[PDB]
Ligand binder design. Structure first.
Ligand code: NAG
Ligand code: NAG
Ligand code: CA
Ligand code: CA
Ligand code: CA
Ligand code: CA
Ligand code: CA
Ligand code: CL
Ligand code: CL
Lengths: 264, 265
C-alpha cells in the first residue's frame, strides 16, 4: 500500500535535506519522523510532494479550498502533514487525527530583558511587540483583547499595541520578518512557540530566547480525507507513541533539551 | 432525545451542587458546563449518574472493565465525562472526543521554599516528594526515570525518590492525602496540575502554591461508546468552543485568574 502525502516546508516540522548531486530530493523533520513511525507501525509506503501554492489552505469565495486542504478534498492527497493546526473550519472539510504535538503562541525576545511573561510585555512602552498581520495569531489577540468576559486585562493592553494603526505600525508581514526584528533587539515577536523556539535554538549569535507560559490553544495534527478510515488508526498509534515517550524522543531530536544555544 | 451520562465526582470538573428540600441531586463544574454547551448545541437532553464503584475504570484480569469505561462498554451509559484523560489503553475500547482541556503533572508544595521547578525539586535531599501510589502519574515517572533516551537527568533523579522502597516511603494513598501532606509541609505532591491548582486556589489558609510549566502529556476528553456517532460531533463543537474563546471563559469560571488565594511565593 502506498499513500500520497502533501506537505509544506516548515522548519523543523518538514525540511528539505541538503541537495547532493546524484541523489534524490529527501525530506526530514519532526513531522516526517512521525509519519515514518506511522508508516512502520501501520505498514504503508508514501510519496511526499509539496503543495503547488505552498499554503496550508484557506477557503475561497466559491466554497473551494486551496493549499493542502484542497488536495485532500480533491483526493489528490491521501493525507497532509506539516505544522497543520486542528481547527474547526478545517475539521469540517477534512478529518484530523488526534494531535501529536501542542500549539501555543510564545514571545521571541532578546536575552537579558526583565520581561518574562505576557503580563510583563503588556506593561512595556519601551519595547514594541506584534505578530504577522492578517494571521490567525493576529485574530487570536483581537478576540482575547476585545472579549469583555476575559478576566485577565493583559490581552486588552496587548491588543492595543498589536492593533495600533490597523497593525501596520507594530506588526510584520511574515514570520521571517518578525524573527529578524526580534534578533535586532528593540522588538518582541509573537508567533508559534515551536517555530520561534527552533529559531532561537539555531540562532548564530544565540542572542534570543523564547517565553512560553501559554497552555495549548490548539494542536498539530495529521489531516486526512473526510471519512478516511485511517484517521482512527493514526490517532491510536499517536496516543501510543505519546504514552511510550517515543514522541518526546523525536521532539528532543529537533527541539533539543540542551543544544547549541542556551535559552536561559 | 436523552443520553445517559456517567461521571465521578472530581473537583472542579464535576461537583455536587447544594440541593435542599429533597430536590434532585444536581451537579456543577467545568466538565458539566462543557456538557451543557454540547447539549444545547447538539439539541439533546441528558441524565447524570455516578459510577457505582466511583472509578474511572481499568481493565481487570479477565479483560472486563469496571468504572466509567465499563459503563460505556456494557452500554449502560451513552457517554462519560469528568476528568478523563485520553489514553491509548482506554481509546482502544471506547472512543474519545478531541480534548476539551489539557492535562499535565504539577507540583503542590508549601509556599516560601526555593523550589520553583522540577529540576530544583530533584536536587532536594531535605524535602520528600511523591505521587499517588499505583497511579498513572507513578508509571509516568517510572518510564521517564528509566528511559536511557530522555535527555533530562531530572526524571531519573525524581524516580529514585518517588520509587524508594517501591514508593512506600514517599507516595500517598490518594490525592486528598497528598494535598493534606503538602499543606502540612516538608512534602511536595506530584499530581494533576488542574486538581492541585484548584486545591491551592481553595486552600483555607492560602498556604500552598503550584508549580506548572509542564507541557501537556495528555488531554481531558469525553468518552463515548465504541463507534458512537456522537464522537465526531462532540469533537467539532469542542473545537468551535475553543476557537470562539468560550472554553477559556468557562475555565476562568472554575480556575479564576484572581479573587481566590494568590499562588505566588
Ligand atoms: C473556484 O475557485 C477556484 C480558485 O482556486 C477555481 O480554481 C475553481 O475553478 C472555482 N470554480 C469551481 C466551480 O470550482
Ligand atoms: C470478570 O470478573 C469480574 C469480577 O470482578 C466480573 O464481575 C465480570 O463479570 C467478569 N467478566 C466476565 C466476562 O465474566
Ligand atoms: Ca472532519
Ligand atoms: Ca517546543
Ligand atoms: Ca484524574
Ligand atoms: Ca476507539
Ligand atoms: Ca542520553
Ligand atoms: Cl479524534
Ligand atoms: Cl499531548
Amino acid at each position: 500500500l502506498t499513500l500520497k502525502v502533501v506537505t509544506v516546508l516548515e522548519e523543523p516540522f518538514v525540511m528539505v535535506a541538503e541537495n547532493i548531486l546524484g541523489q534524490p530530493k529527501r525530506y526530514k523533520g519532526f513531522s516526517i519522523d512521525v509519519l515514518d513511525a506511522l508508516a512502520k507501525a501501520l505498514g504503508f509506503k508514501y510519496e511526499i510532494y509539496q503543495a503547488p501554492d505552498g499554503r496550508y489552505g484557506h477557503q475561497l469565495h466559491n466554497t473551494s479550498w486551496n493549499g493542502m486542504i484542497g488536495e485532500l478534498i480533491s483526493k489528490r492527497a491521501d493525507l497532509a502533514i506539516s505544522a497543520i493546526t486542528i481547527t474547526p473550519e478545517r475539521e469540517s472539510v477534512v478529518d484530523f487525527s488526534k494531535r501529536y504535538m501542542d500549539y501555543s503562541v510564545g514571545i521571541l525576545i532578546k536575552k537579558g530583558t526583565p520581561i518574562r511573561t505576557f503580563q510583563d510585555l503588556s506593561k512595556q512602552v519601551e519595547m514594541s511587540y506584534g505578530t504577522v498581520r492578517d494571521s490567525a495569531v493576529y485574530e487570536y489577540f483581537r478576540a482575547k483583547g476585545t472579549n469583555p468576559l476575559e478576566q485577565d486585562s493583559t490581552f486588552a493592553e496587548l491588543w492595543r499595541t498589536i492593533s495600533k494603526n490597523g497593525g501596520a505600525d507594530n506588526c510584520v508581514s511574515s514570520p521571517s520578518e518578525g524573527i529578524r526584528k526580534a534578533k535586532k533587539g528593540n522588538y518582541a515577536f509573537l508567533w508559534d512557540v515551536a517555530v520561534v523556539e527552533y529559531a532561537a535554538l539555531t540562532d548564530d549569535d544565540c542572542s534570543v530566547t523564547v517565553i512560553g507560559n501559554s497552555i495549548s490553544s490548539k494542536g498539530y495534527g495529521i489531516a486526512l480525507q473526510h471519512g478516511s478510515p485511517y484517521r482512527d488508526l493514526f490517532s491510536q498509534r499517536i496516543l501510543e507513541l505519546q504514552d511510550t515517550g517515543d514522541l518526546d524522543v523525536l521532539k528532543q531530536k529537533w527541539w533539543p533539551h540542551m543544544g547549541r544555544c542556551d535559552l536561559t
